[PDB]
Amino acid sequence: VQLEESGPGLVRPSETLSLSCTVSGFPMNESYFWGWIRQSPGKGLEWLGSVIHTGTTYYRPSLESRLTIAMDPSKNQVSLSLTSVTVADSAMYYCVRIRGGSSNWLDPWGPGIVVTASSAKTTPPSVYPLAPGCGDTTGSSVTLGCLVKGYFPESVTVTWNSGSVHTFPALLQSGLYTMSSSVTVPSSTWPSQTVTCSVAHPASSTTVDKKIEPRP
Amino acid sequence: QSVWTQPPSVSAAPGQNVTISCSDSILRSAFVSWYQQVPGSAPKLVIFDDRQRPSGIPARFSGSNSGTTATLDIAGLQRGDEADYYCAAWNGRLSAFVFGSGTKLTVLGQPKSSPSVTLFPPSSEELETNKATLVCTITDFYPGVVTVDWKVDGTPVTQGMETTQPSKQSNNKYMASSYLTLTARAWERHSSYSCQVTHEGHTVEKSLSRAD
Protein backbone atom coordinates (compact mmCIF):
# COMPACT_ATOMS: atom_id res chain seq x y z
CA VAL A 1 0.00 0.00 0.00
CA GLN A 2 2.10 2.95 -1.42
CA LEU A 3 0.54 6.42 -1.91
CA GLU A 4 2.41 8.79 -4.29
CA GLU A 5 1.70 12.55 -4.70
CA SER A 6 2.45 14.25 -8.10
CA GLY A 7 2.01 17.79 -9.57
CA PRO A 8 3.65 21.23 -9.97
CA GLY A 9 6.19 22.44 -7.32
CA LEU A 10 5.55 26.14 -8.14
CA VAL A 11 2.03 27.69 -8.28
CA ARG A 12 1.15 31.37 -8.97
CA PRO A 13 -1.05 33.25 -6.46
CA SER A 14 -4.72 33.62 -7.68
CA GLU A 15 -4.45 30.40 -9.86
CA THR A 16 -5.55 26.83 -8.93
CA LEU A 17 -3.34 24.22 -7.15
CA SER A 18 -4.01 20.73 -8.64
CA LEU A 19 -2.26 17.67 -7.05
CA SER A 20 -2.77 13.95 -7.88
CA CYS A 21 -2.11 10.82 -5.74
CA THR A 22 -1.69 7.26 -7.21
CA VAL A 23 -2.69 4.27 -4.98
CA SER A 24 -0.78 0.93 -5.46
CA GLY A 25 -1.37 -2.50 -3.80
CA PHE A 26 -4.90 -1.82 -2.34
CA PRO A 27 -8.38 -1.46 -3.94
CA MET A 28 -10.15 1.94 -3.46
CA ASN A 29 -13.41 -0.19 -3.64
CA GLU A 30 -12.99 -0.71 0.18
CA SER A 31 -14.37 1.11 3.33
CA TYR A 32 -11.65 3.86 3.55
CA PHE A 33 -11.54 7.67 3.13
CA TRP A 34 -8.76 9.10 0.87
CA GLY A 35 -7.57 12.59 1.79
CA TRP A 36 -5.01 15.39 1.97
CA ILE A 37 -3.01 16.91 4.88
CA ARG A 38 -0.61 19.88 4.42
CA GLN A 39 2.30 21.18 6.60
CA SER A 40 3.80 24.72 6.18
CA PRO A 41 7.57 24.89 6.89
CA GLY A 42 8.07 24.30 10.68
CA LYS A 43 4.30 24.74 11.30
CA GLY A 44 1.88 21.88 12.20
CA LEU A 45 -0.34 19.44 10.27
CA GLU A 46 -3.63 20.75 8.84
CA TRP A 47 -6.39 18.41 7.63
CA LEU A 48 -7.75 19.72 4.28
CA GLY A 49 -10.52 17.10 3.78
CA SER A 50 -11.23 13.52 2.57
CA VAL A 51 -13.57 11.49 0.25
CA ILE A 52 -15.05 7.92 0.15
CA HIS A 53 -16.09 5.94 -3.03
CA THR A 54 -19.83 6.71 -2.22
CA GLY A 55 -19.04 10.38 -3.07
CA THR A 56 -19.30 11.63 0.57
CA THR A 57 -16.69 14.44 1.07
CA TYR A 58 -15.53 16.23 4.32
CA TYR A 59 -13.56 19.56 4.30
CA ARG A 60 -11.80 22.05 6.60
CA PRO A 61 -14.70 24.58 7.04
CA SER A 62 -12.54 27.80 6.63
CA LEU A 63 -11.18 26.37 3.23
CA GLU A 64 -14.38 24.39 2.27
CA SER A 65 -15.44 26.90 -0.49
CA ARG A 66 -11.92 26.76 -2.22
CA LEU A 67 -11.44 22.94 -1.82
CA THR A 68 -12.33 20.00 -4.22
CA ILE A 69 -11.22 16.45 -3.16
CA ALA A 70 -12.26 13.79 -5.78
CA MET A 71 -11.30 10.08 -6.30
CA ASP A 72 -11.58 7.72 -9.34
CA PRO A 73 -11.25 4.08 -8.14
CA SER A 74 -10.69 2.80 -11.76
CA LYS A 75 -7.52 4.97 -12.13
CA ASN A 76 -6.46 4.21 -8.47
CA GLN A 77 -6.14 8.05 -8.17
CA VAL A 78 -7.34 10.76 -5.73
CA SER A 79 -7.19 14.45 -6.81
CA LEU A 80 -6.95 17.75 -4.87
CA SER A 81 -8.02 21.12 -6.36
CA LEU A 82 -7.46 24.35 -4.33
CA THR A 83 -8.59 27.54 -6.15
CA SER A 84 -7.48 31.19 -5.57
CA VAL A 85 -4.11 30.14 -4.02
CA THR A 86 -2.20 32.76 -1.94
CA VAL A 87 1.40 32.83 -0.55
CA ALA A 88 -0.22 31.21 2.60
CA ASP A 89 -0.67 27.87 0.64
CA SER A 90 3.11 27.06 0.39
CA ALA A 91 3.29 23.60 2.07
CA MET A 92 4.27 19.96 1.92
CA TYR A 93 1.03 18.21 0.71
CA TYR A 94 0.48 14.56 1.79
CA CYS A 95 -1.99 11.96 0.43
CA VAL A 96 -3.45 9.73 3.27
CA ARG A 97 -5.55 6.55 3.57
CA ILE A 98 -8.08 7.10 6.44
CA ARG A 99 -10.20 4.66 8.52
CA GLY A 100 -13.48 6.60 9.04
CA GLY A 101 -16.39 6.30 11.49
CA SER A 102 -15.35 7.17 15.09
CA SER A 103 -11.70 5.98 14.52
CA ASN A 104 -10.18 8.65 12.17
CA TRP A 105 -6.65 7.18 11.84
CA LEU A 106 -4.34 7.97 8.89
CA ASP A 107 -2.13 5.09 7.59
CA PRO A 108 -0.26 5.06 5.37
CA TRP A 109 1.02 8.52 4.23
CA GLY A 110 2.66 9.40 0.88
CA PRO A 111 6.27 10.77 0.93
CA GLY A 112 4.72 14.24 0.27
CA ILE A 113 5.24 16.96 -2.39
CA VAL A 114 6.69 20.48 -1.75
CA VAL A 115 4.46 23.25 -3.17
CA THR A 116 5.73 26.86 -3.28
CA ALA A 117 3.11 29.61 -3.83
CA SER A 118 4.90 32.73 -5.26
CA SER A 119 4.61 35.25 -8.21
CA ALA A 120 8.44 35.77 -8.15
CA LYS A 121 10.55 35.38 -11.28
CA THR A 122 14.30 34.73 -10.60
CA THR A 123 15.33 37.58 -8.18
CA PRO A 124 18.76 38.43 -6.65
CA PRO A 125 18.79 39.27 -2.92
CA SER A 126 19.30 42.67 -1.23
CA VAL A 127 22.10 42.32 1.37
CA TYR A 128 22.01 44.58 4.47
CA PRO A 129 24.80 44.86 7.05
CA LEU A 130 24.05 43.98 10.72
CA ALA A 131 26.34 46.09 12.96
CA PRO A 132 25.66 46.25 16.75
CA GLY A 133 23.50 49.26 17.72
CA CYS A 134 23.88 51.77 20.56
CA GLY A 135 24.47 49.17 23.36
CA ASP A 136 27.49 47.39 24.97
CA THR A 137 30.84 48.81 23.58
CA THR A 138 32.78 47.10 26.51
CA GLY A 139 32.44 43.36 25.43
CA SER A 140 35.46 41.11 24.50
CA SER A 141 33.58 39.50 21.53
CA VAL A 142 31.49 41.36 18.85
CA THR A 143 28.89 39.75 16.49
CA LEU A 144 28.24 41.15 12.96
CA GLY A 145 25.73 39.92 10.35
CA CYS A 146 24.24 40.02 6.81
CA LEU A 147 20.47 40.08 6.19
CA VAL A 148 19.86 38.40 2.79
CA LYS A 149 16.34 39.53 1.79
CA GLY A 150 13.94 39.07 -1.14
CA TYR A 151 15.57 36.39 -3.36
CA PHE A 152 14.02 33.64 -5.54
CA PRO A 153 14.57 30.85 -5.90
CA GLU A 154 16.81 29.05 -3.33
CA SER A 155 19.58 28.88 -2.59
CA VAL A 156 22.36 31.39 -1.58
CA THR A 157 25.86 30.86 -0.08
CA VAL A 158 27.26 33.35 2.53
CA THR A 159 31.10 33.45 2.88
CA TRP A 160 32.75 35.75 5.53
CA ASN A 161 36.24 37.32 4.94
CA SER A 162 36.63 34.87 1.93
CA GLY A 163 36.52 31.96 4.51
CA SER A 164 32.33 31.49 14.55
CA VAL A 165 29.84 31.70 11.60
CA HIS A 166 26.13 30.95 12.21
CA THR A 167 24.10 30.46 8.96
CA PHE A 168 20.31 30.67 9.71
CA PRO A 169 17.91 28.85 7.33
CA ALA A 170 15.68 30.67 4.77
CA LEU A 171 12.01 31.77 5.36
CA LEU A 172 9.26 32.32 2.75
CA GLN A 173 8.14 35.99 3.45
CA SER A 174 5.27 36.84 0.99
CA GLY A 175 6.70 35.04 -2.10
CA LEU A 176 10.48 35.62 -1.53
CA TYR A 177 13.25 33.94 0.58
CA THR A 178 14.98 35.81 3.46
CA MET A 179 17.91 34.28 5.49
CA SER A 180 20.69 35.76 7.66
CA SER A 181 24.26 34.85 8.67
CA SER A 182 26.35 36.10 11.68
CA VAL A 183 30.08 36.08 12.54
CA THR A 184 31.52 36.55 16.07
CA VAL A 185 35.11 37.99 16.11
CA PRO A 186 37.36 39.48 18.84
CA SER A 187 36.22 43.04 19.71
CA SER A 188 39.85 44.38 19.22
CA THR A 189 39.80 43.30 15.47
CA TRP A 190 36.61 45.30 14.54
CA PRO A 191 36.03 47.91 13.35
CA SER A 192 39.93 48.19 13.11
CA GLN A 193 40.13 45.31 10.47
CA THR A 194 37.65 44.90 7.53
CA VAL A 195 34.81 42.32 7.95
CA THR A 196 32.97 41.51 4.68
CA CYS A 197 30.12 39.05 3.96
CA SER A 198 30.08 37.72 0.34
CA VAL A 199 26.61 36.49 -0.85
CA ALA A 200 26.40 34.32 -4.03
CA HIS A 201 22.97 33.62 -5.68
CA PRO A 202 23.71 31.25 -8.63
CA ALA A 203 20.16 31.40 -10.20
CA SER A 204 20.62 35.21 -10.89
CA SER A 205 24.47 34.92 -11.42
CA THR A 206 24.89 37.60 -8.70
CA THR A 207 27.55 38.06 -5.96
CA VAL A 208 27.17 40.89 -3.34
CA ASP A 209 30.19 41.84 -1.09
CA LYS A 210 29.07 43.96 1.98
CA LYS A 211 31.71 45.51 4.28
CA ILE A 212 30.24 45.86 7.82
CA GLU A 213 30.73 49.54 8.93
CA PRO A 214 30.16 50.74 12.54
CA ARG A 215 27.14 53.05 13.35
CA PRO A 216 27.80 56.74 14.30
CA GLN B 1 -10.70 23.88 19.61
CA SER B 2 -9.35 24.17 15.96
CA VAL B 3 -5.86 22.97 17.12
CA TRP B 4 -5.48 20.60 20.15
CA THR B 5 -3.02 21.84 22.86
CA GLN B 6 0.24 19.85 23.33
CA PRO B 7 3.43 21.03 25.09
CA PRO B 8 5.96 22.26 22.47
CA SER B 9 8.92 20.46 24.22
CA VAL B 10 9.35 17.17 26.16
CA SER B 11 12.82 15.73 26.88
CA ALA B 12 14.47 12.91 28.92
CA ALA B 13 17.72 10.81 29.01
CA PRO B 14 17.76 7.44 27.17
CA GLY B 15 15.93 4.81 29.34
CA GLN B 16 13.57 7.35 31.09
CA ASN B 17 9.72 7.34 30.67
CA VAL B 18 7.97 10.38 29.04
CA THR B 19 4.34 11.60 28.69
CA ILE B 20 3.03 13.87 25.89
CA SER B 21 -0.37 15.54 26.72
CA CYS B 22 -3.15 16.46 24.20
CA SER B 23 -5.90 18.97 25.37
CA ASP B 24 -14.00 20.41 27.60
CA SER B 25 -14.06 16.53 27.61
CA ILE B 26 -14.65 16.65 23.78
CA LEU B 27 -11.48 14.43 23.40
CA ARG B 28 -13.16 11.55 25.40
CA SER B 29 -15.91 11.85 22.71
CA ALA B 30 -13.59 10.68 19.80
CA PHE B 31 -10.76 8.11 19.18
CA VAL B 32 -7.36 9.93 19.55
CA SER B 33 -4.52 9.05 17.12
CA TRP B 34 -0.77 9.95 17.46
CA TYR B 35 1.80 10.47 14.65
CA GLN B 36 5.65 10.47 14.80
CA GLN B 37 7.50 12.69 12.26
CA VAL B 38 11.33 12.79 11.86
CA PRO B 39 12.65 15.64 9.58
CA GLY B 40 12.41 14.87 5.81
CA SER B 41 9.86 11.97 6.23
CA ALA B 42 6.02 11.82 6.29
CA PRO B 43 4.19 11.35 9.61
CA LYS B 44 3.83 7.69 10.69
CA LEU B 45 0.83 6.38 12.69
CA VAL B 46 2.04 5.22 16.14
CA ILE B 47 -1.28 4.93 18.15
CA PHE B 48 -4.92 4.59 16.90
CA ASP B 49 -8.31 4.22 18.71
CA ASP B 50 -6.84 5.91 21.89
CA ARG B 51 -4.70 2.85 22.97
CA GLN B 52 -3.93 0.43 20.06
CA ARG B 53 -0.54 0.03 18.25
CA PRO B 54 -0.34 -0.74 14.50
CA SER B 55 2.22 -3.42 13.41
CA GLY B 56 5.94 -2.72 14.19
CA ILE B 57 5.18 -0.36 17.16
CA PRO B 58 6.62 -1.89 20.37
CA ALA B 59 4.76 -2.28 23.71
CA ARG B 60 6.66 0.63 25.42
CA PHE B 61 4.43 2.95 23.27
CA SER B 62 0.89 3.37 24.79
CA GLY B 63 -1.96 5.94 24.86
CA SER B 64 -4.84 6.89 27.19
CA ASN B 65 -7.88 9.16 26.50
CA SER B 66 -9.59 10.23 29.76
CA GLY B 67 -11.84 13.36 29.54
CA THR B 68 -9.57 16.42 29.54
CA THR B 69 -6.08 15.07 28.56
CA ALA B 70 -5.27 12.22 26.08
CA THR B 71 -1.63 11.00 26.64
CA LEU B 72 1.10 9.37 24.52
CA ASP B 73 3.33 7.34 26.91
CA ILE B 74 6.81 6.04 25.92
CA ALA B 75 8.79 3.88 28.42
CA GLY B 76 12.50 2.95 27.79
CA LEU B 77 13.11 6.10 25.68
CA GLN B 78 15.56 5.49 22.72
CA ARG B 79 17.45 8.03 20.50
CA GLY B 80 15.38 6.79 17.49
CA ASP B 81 12.21 7.97 19.35
CA GLU B 82 13.45 11.63 18.89
CA ALA B 83 10.78 13.30 16.68
CA ASP B 84 7.69 15.54 16.45
CA TYR B 85 4.56 13.87 17.89
CA TYR B 86 1.09 15.16 16.93
CA CYS B 87 -2.16 13.97 18.51
CA ALA B 88 -5.25 14.06 16.24
CA ALA B 89 -9.03 13.70 16.81
CA TRP B 90 -12.44 14.66 15.30
CA ASN B 91 -14.08 17.87 16.69
CA GLY B 92 -17.87 17.23 16.04
CA ARG B 93 -18.38 20.86 17.28
CA LEU B 94 -16.24 22.24 14.33
CA SER B 95 -17.07 18.99 12.37
CA ALA B 96 -13.41 18.81 11.17
CA PHE B 97 -10.43 16.47 11.83
CA VAL B 98 -8.12 18.44 14.19
CA PHE B 99 -4.41 17.87 14.87
CA GLY B 100 -2.58 19.02 18.01
CA SER B 101 0.12 21.79 18.14
CA GLY B 102 2.85 19.07 18.02
CA THR B 103 5.47 18.14 20.63
CA LYS B 104 9.22 17.86 19.93
CA LEU B 105 10.51 14.87 21.98
CA THR B 106 14.31 15.33 22.51
CA VAL B 107 16.32 12.34 23.85
CA LEU B 108 18.99 14.30 25.79
CA GLY B 109 22.55 13.79 24.44
CA GLN B 110 24.08 16.84 26.21
CA PRO B 111 23.34 19.33 29.05
CA LYS B 112 20.36 21.64 28.43
CA SER B 113 21.80 24.90 27.10
CA SER B 114 20.15 28.37 27.26
CA PRO B 115 19.89 30.34 24.01
CA SER B 116 22.35 33.13 23.25
CA VAL B 117 20.37 36.03 21.74
CA THR B 118 21.59 39.08 19.70
CA LEU B 119 19.24 41.91 18.56
CA PHE B 120 20.35 43.91 15.45
CA PRO B 121 18.76 47.26 14.53
CA PRO B 122 17.86 47.88 10.86
CA SER B 123 20.61 49.12 8.44
CA SER B 124 20.35 52.70 7.02
CA GLU B 125 20.60 51.04 3.53
CA GLU B 126 17.26 49.21 4.22
CA LEU B 127 15.67 52.40 5.74
CA GLU B 128 16.36 54.18 2.35
CA THR B 129 13.78 51.61 0.94
CA ASN B 130 11.11 52.74 3.54
CA LYS B 131 11.58 49.37 5.32
CA ALA B 132 13.02 48.36 8.72
CA THR B 133 13.81 44.73 9.68
CA LEU B 134 15.03 44.00 13.25
CA VAL B 135 16.96 40.68 13.26
CA CYS B 136 17.04 38.53 16.43
CA THR B 137 19.71 35.75 16.24
CA ILE B 138 19.27 32.81 18.69
CA THR B 139 22.24 30.35 19.04
CA ASP B 140 23.45 27.44 21.24
CA PHE B 141 20.02 26.28 22.61
CA TYR B 142 19.18 22.64 23.49
CA PRO B 143 16.63 21.21 23.27
CA GLY B 144 15.95 22.80 19.82
CA VAL B 145 12.58 24.43 20.76
CA VAL B 146 12.05 28.20 21.36
CA THR B 147 9.02 30.53 21.27
CA VAL B 148 9.78 34.13 20.14
CA ASP B 149 7.64 37.15 21.17
CA TRP B 150 8.44 40.85 20.34
CA LYS B 151 7.52 44.09 22.23
CA VAL B 152 7.61 47.76 21.01
CA ASP B 153 7.59 50.42 23.82
CA GLY B 154 6.50 47.69 26.32
CA THR B 155 3.52 46.42 24.16
CA PRO B 156 3.39 42.90 22.62
CA VAL B 157 3.60 42.89 18.76
CA THR B 158 0.78 40.89 17.05
CA GLN B 159 1.86 41.14 13.33
CA GLY B 160 5.01 41.63 11.12
CA MET B 161 7.05 38.87 12.88
CA GLU B 162 8.46 35.61 11.39
CA THR B 163 10.74 33.03 13.07
CA THR B 164 12.82 30.30 11.33
CA GLN B 165 12.60 26.60 12.23
CA PRO B 166 15.58 25.54 14.44
CA SER B 167 18.68 24.07 12.66
CA LYS B 168 21.47 21.94 14.21
CA GLN B 169 24.90 23.58 14.91
CA SER B 170 28.06 21.42 14.59
CA ASN B 171 28.00 21.17 18.48
CA ASN B 172 24.46 19.56 18.15
CA LYS B 173 22.75 22.59 19.79
CA TYR B 174 20.26 24.60 17.69
CA MET B 175 20.18 28.04 16.01
CA ALA B 176 17.24 30.19 14.76
CA SER B 177 16.51 33.83 13.86
CA SER B 178 13.34 35.94 14.19
CA TYR B 179 12.57 38.96 11.92
CA LEU B 180 10.34 41.96 12.82
CA THR B 181 9.51 43.97 9.64
CA LEU B 182 8.15 47.55 10.20
CA THR B 183 7.78 50.60 7.92
CA ALA B 184 10.69 53.12 8.23
CA ARG B 185 8.18 55.59 9.81
CA ALA B 186 7.14 52.99 12.48
CA TRP B 187 10.87 52.47 13.29
CA GLU B 188 11.44 56.28 13.65
CA ARG B 189 8.16 56.72 15.73
CA HIS B 190 8.89 54.09 18.52
CA SER B 191 11.62 54.37 21.23
CA SER B 192 12.47 50.79 22.44
CA TYR B 193 12.35 47.30 20.81
CA SER B 194 12.47 43.88 22.50
CA CYS B 195 13.13 40.29 21.34
CA GLN B 196 11.90 37.67 23.90
CA VAL B 197 13.06 34.02 23.58
CA THR B 198 11.47 31.33 25.79
CA HIS B 199 13.42 28.03 26.21
CA GLU B 200 12.28 25.23 28.65
CA GLY B 201 10.01 27.80 30.43
CA HIS B 202 12.81 30.44 30.95
CA THR B 203 12.96 33.73 29.00
CA VAL B 204 16.05 35.56 27.58
CA GLU B 205 15.16 39.18 26.57
CA LYS B 206 17.49 41.42 24.43
CA SER B 207 16.22 44.99 23.78
CA LEU B 208 17.49 48.24 22.18
CA SER B 209 16.39 51.95 22.28
CA ARG B 210 17.08 53.99 19.07
CA ALA B 211 17.95 57.02 21.33
CA ASP B 212 20.71 57.29 24.05
Binding site: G100, G101, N104 | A30, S95
Partner: peptide
Protein backbone atom coordinates in the same frame (compact mmCIF):
# COMPACT_ATOMS: atom_id res chain seq x y z
CA UNK C 1 -19.88 3.99 10.82
CA UNK C 2 -19.07 2.44 7.37
CA UNK C 3 -18.63 5.65 5.26
CA UNK C 4 -19.33 8.68 7.57
CA UNK C 5 -16.61 10.48 9.83
CA UNK C 6 -17.55 11.64 13.34
CA UNK C 7 -17.53 11.18 17.18
CA UNK C 8 -17.82 7.84 19.15
CA UNK C 9 -21.23 6.04 18.99
Amino acid sequence: EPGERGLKG
